[PDB]
């Protein structure tokens, strides 16, 4: 469960009926390091408006 929750058997959940996030969850996915922090990021000296 610590290494990869839900891969083998049934995922261990918390008090909110939501499975906990493991190391693999942080590594991979659309919310992982590669796609959320390394291939794109938020920057300084930027603004937006209409």
């Amino acid at each position: 469960a610590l290494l990869d929750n839900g891969r083998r058997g049934r995922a261990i959940t918390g008090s909110n009926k939501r499975p906990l996030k493991s190391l693999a969850d942080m590594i991979k996915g659309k919310q992982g390091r590669f796609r959320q922090n390394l291939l794109g990021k938020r920057v300084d000296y930027s603004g937006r408006s209409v």
């Binding site: 261990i12 959940t13 918390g14 008090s15």
Partner: protein, 53 residues
């Protein structure tokens, strides 16, 4: 009449104390009590604590 160390069969009236056990739990605060409960859980396989996982 004599002062010696001996092994013998005698008939005696014996007194004994009966207090000390489970009295240490009163002085402990809640955090130390929980720590001691965790230490007791580790050694006793038949003790468990309620979990929500």
């Amino acid at each position: 009449m004599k002062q010696g160390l001996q092994l013998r069969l005698s008939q005696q009236l014996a007194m004994t104390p009966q207090l000390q056990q489970a009295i240490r739990l009163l002085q402990l605060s809640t955090l130390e009590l929980q720590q001691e409960l965790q230490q007791a859980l580790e050694s006793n396989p038949l003790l468990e604590q309620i979990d929500t996982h």
